[PDB]
Amino acid sequence: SSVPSQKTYQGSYGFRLGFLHSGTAKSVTCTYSPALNKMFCQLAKTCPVQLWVDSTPPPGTRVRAMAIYKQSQHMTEVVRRCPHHERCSDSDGLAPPQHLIRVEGNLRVEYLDDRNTFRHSVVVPYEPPEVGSDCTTIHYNYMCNSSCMGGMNRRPILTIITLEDSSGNLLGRNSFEVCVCACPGRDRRREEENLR
Amino acid sequence: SVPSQKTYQGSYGFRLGFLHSGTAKSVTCTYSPALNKMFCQLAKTCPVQLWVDSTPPPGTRVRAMAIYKQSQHMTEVVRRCPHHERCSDSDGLAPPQHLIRVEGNLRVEYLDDRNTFRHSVVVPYEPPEVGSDCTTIHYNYMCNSSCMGGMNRRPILTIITLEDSSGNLLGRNSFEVCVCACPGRDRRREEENLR
Amino acid sequence: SSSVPSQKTYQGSYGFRLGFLHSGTAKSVTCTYSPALNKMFCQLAKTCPVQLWVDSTPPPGTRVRAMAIYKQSQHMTEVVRRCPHHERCSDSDGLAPPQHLIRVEGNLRVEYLDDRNTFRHSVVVPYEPPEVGSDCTTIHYNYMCNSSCMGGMNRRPILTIITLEDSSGNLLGRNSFEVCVCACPGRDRRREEENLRK
Amino acid sequence: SVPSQKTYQGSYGFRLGFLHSGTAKSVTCTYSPALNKMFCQLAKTCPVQLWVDSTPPPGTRVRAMAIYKQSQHMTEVVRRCPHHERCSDSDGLAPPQHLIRVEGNLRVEYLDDRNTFRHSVVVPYEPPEVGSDCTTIHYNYMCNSSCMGGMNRRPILTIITLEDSSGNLLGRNSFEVCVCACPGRDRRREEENLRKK
DNA sequence: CGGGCATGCCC
DNA sequence: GGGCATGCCCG
DNA sequence: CGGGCATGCCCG
DNA sequence: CGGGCATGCCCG
Ligand SMILES: [Zn+2]
Ligand SMILES: [Zn+2]
Ligand SMILES: [Zn+2]
Ligand SMILES: [Zn+2]
């Protein structure tokens, strides 16, 4: 199917993303590079993504994550787990086995296999920050490596995070590149070295 | 019930031979006598020679089958990984799940054993061409030793059996195999691991 | 294609077999047959005489079909057709479809078949008995693409299968021969003949 | 009707540079100054440097086009042969028929000319990166000079033009190209053949 | 990549 | 027939 | 943890 | 090729 938009749209609520500072130890579980707008993370490890808003979205608002290929020649291809990982015994009880992106720690998560575009996405209700907190954090997990054969096969992906109303209308959108890999700190440091 | 790997030259004096192709980093197929191990690239020609002291009767068949080498893995059927089983690399004759193919023989026959679930590939035995002392079969291995969800860096043995037209055993030999990107580089590594 | 046709020699009830001319190996002779290899070496679009020999005469309605297949088992399911260039080079003889490798010359009753189910190409003419004073029936074939053509045969050897059939397509007889369509048939014949002598 | 090939530096002092990669038998891309001729392998990176004396205005673009070198063949559009046109070698951007592609530039644009039907490939001009004195474009040639039904052993020139945003000419350079299996062998041979006995 | 040789195509 | 130009295999 | 190395694969 | 490097994964 045609590739969903990745255009940054803060919208009426001033929707932005934030990421924890985690450092670049060789095999740190998850690390974000501001200079690349790129997350490096290990398979099945917690990846925190922060939602920041200037004003609070309505009740019933939801937050959706979807992966797409970054490169034009691959844009029409659905991002999914490789044949091996799809057939592994790693089900969390909620996510269909073909889905790359899962959410942990939220029993209200829903998974969509779009009947029109065949793309996968994972969505949770938007909860405003608890009093004393400045942002809302969602814990994602990526369940296949960037390097997997028959899956991403070293082709870079973007994760698109959208804020939507209860009926699915777009309220806001942001995105970040992601590399799922064995050694996120090593690889972040290497990619950062390369723009020099 | 693990297939036998016991060497049996039998009445026809059946032995295997290999081409000695050296250890250039990316040589297609190379055999290590020290290890009795063939190192070869995925989908490329792997020649295996059949040598006999006397000629088996027409109707004789030659079967190849892979098993895991390590005792703890021996009962597991050797098959292509989920990625490679789904690739569009059919030659029109081989089943997509089979690790070992034979190339260049229209009489090739593949078996999924109904009882053991093991895969094998069999061709008719033919005597050497005039002036030649051996019969060469061209095998292809269709998954890397390193493939996740497949061999997963577990060593395999290929067992070559000479059979009569009804399947009775006439001879057996075997060799270890590593299917890899750089067979010359890798042959040298395993050899030095001992001495 | 999902299957492969038989290439087994079958003389049948009429004692059907093939014959070929003695043409020699003068480097660039237009067509030459190697009895040792059962292989015809010829130039693109040049006449390739093939003789049909029979012990008794098949009845009117009998047909003679020619079909190419790849010789190597790993390519045998792939339909032999002309390369993208030759398919488009506007060299029609008025009857042969542009995709067909094998043509027949000089026969107004030639028919070209593109099999709806195997997708294989073939060319067929009515069987005619030999002319007076002759022992055999000669068909003039042409091969319209080189063995070396990219996107075509791509250096893969082919076999031509000649079948004798009744009016319904039932098999009456079969024979086959290898073919290389190349620039220098004499040279290439001699080189391939040398390659056992080694 | 034939596009001009006449070299001229123009007001920005535009000229080309090439990597001097030598003549090892199968070097992937090499350039002969004596012949003003690039020899390169199909689909391999062919770096061409743009050198200017002063920086051209915003919106400047750089176009490449192939034409046959021989006068008898000049009016024929240079295109890929039927085989290569149909190979599964697409980069997702170049039309299947085009001989010349640009690699590693997401802003590449391709043109089939309305009047002449000739093919060209155009990129925005960018000034040299910091610490560099020239701008490099990575071309690929997607058909061999020898291809039957394509160039068929007929020599070609590549014409590189510096253009304003509207397509008006600012500068032009050209070089002969042979796309072949063994660029070093073939370059060394052609240069060996320049002299007398 | 590239030595060795197949294959096109002149003399 | 001779010789060379040019592509391709598999190390 | 970082150092180190095995293994696939790609620029030239 | 074959030197080099990306990437998984082991080891102390
Ligand atoms: Zn995976
Ligand atoms: Zn595999
Ligand atoms: Zn052709
Ligand atoms: Zn071409």
Author numbering:
A (entry chain D): 95 to 290
B (entry chain C): 96 to 290
C (entry chain B): 94 to 291
D (entry chain A): 96 to 292
Original authors' sentences:
In the case of R273H and R273C, it was shown that the replacement of threonine by arginine at position 284 (T284R) restores activity to both p53 mutants. Crystal structures of p53 rescued proteins in complexes with DNA were obtained for three double mutants: R273H/T284R, R273C/T284R and R273C/S240R. The crystal structure of R273C/T284R-DNA (space group P1) is similar to that of type I complexes with a two base-pair spacer between the DNA half-sites. In the first case, two dodecameric duplexes bound to two p53 core-domain dimers are stacked end-to-end, and hence the decameric half-sites are separated by two base pairs. The loss of protein–DNA contacts as a result of the primary mutations, R273H or R273C, is compensated for by a new interaction between the side chain of T284R with the same DNA phosphate oxygen shown to interact with R273 in the wt p53-DNA complex. In the reactivated double mutants bound to DNA, the shortest distances of the mutated amino acids, histidine and cysteine, from the DNA backbone are close to 4 and 6 Å, respectively. In type I complex of R273C/T284R, R248 residues appear occasionally disordered and form water-mediated interactions with the N3 atoms of the two symmetrically disposed adenine bases. The crystal structures of the DNA-contact mutants, R273H and R273C, and of the reactivated proteins, demonstrate that p53 inactivation results from the incapacity of the mutated residues to form stabilizing interactions with the DNA backbone, and that p53 rescue can be achieved by alternative protein–DNA interactions formed by the second-site suppressor mutations, T284R and S240R.
